[PDB]
Design a protein around this nucleic acid. Structure first.
Ligand SMILES: [Zn+2]
Ligand SMILES: [Zn+2]
Ligand SMILES: [Zn+2]
Ligand SMILES: [Zn+2]
Lengths: 71, 74
DNA sequence: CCAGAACATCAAGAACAG
DNA sequence: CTGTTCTTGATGTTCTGG
């Protein structure tokens, strides 16, 4: 019943596994406009309801990594 | 011959609340400075703040400030 | 020159529309 | 569900009085 990216709330399957409302919207806007998001630390940046915004780079790869795509 | 931000690195504005800050940094501080922002760091309070990633970790940023010795006036 | 106020952006997460 | 638009907090850049 929970997201597999941020771990918050699941809304359904989108471009792959379960995602939160935002993780859905994020993944697209993100992977499409190809923006080299660079982590600010050591890439392990824990992502969740509270922090997911803090670092697109880490969030984004968590997507590809946890299975996700555009088609 | 260029003055640089002691916090973000962007083009420095002036001596604000304590040090050579960038435009935003000045403001950024004052706002959060005294307020319940409750910013949360991602990793270990040791991120690297530069003009293009200052938005990422507020916590670290502000902390860097307090560390650089900024202030409002006690 | 600087601390603030005032006016202007960005972008994330929610609410919609098809 | 997926594509698009709206709302709003967090930020940024100008404009002001002392
Ligand atoms: Zn999520
Ligand atoms: Zn990160
Ligand atoms: Zn700065
Ligand atoms: Zn941080």
């Amino acid at each position: 019943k929970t997201c597999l990216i941020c771990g918050d709330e699941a809304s359904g399957a989108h471009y792959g596994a379960l995602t939160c409302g935002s993780c859905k919207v994020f993944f697209k806007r993100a992977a499409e406009g190809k923006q080299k998001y660079l982590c600010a630390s050591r890439n392990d940046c824990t992502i969740d309801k509270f922090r997911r915004k803090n670092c697109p780079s880490c969030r984004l790869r968590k997507c590809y990594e946890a299975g996700m795509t555009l088609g």
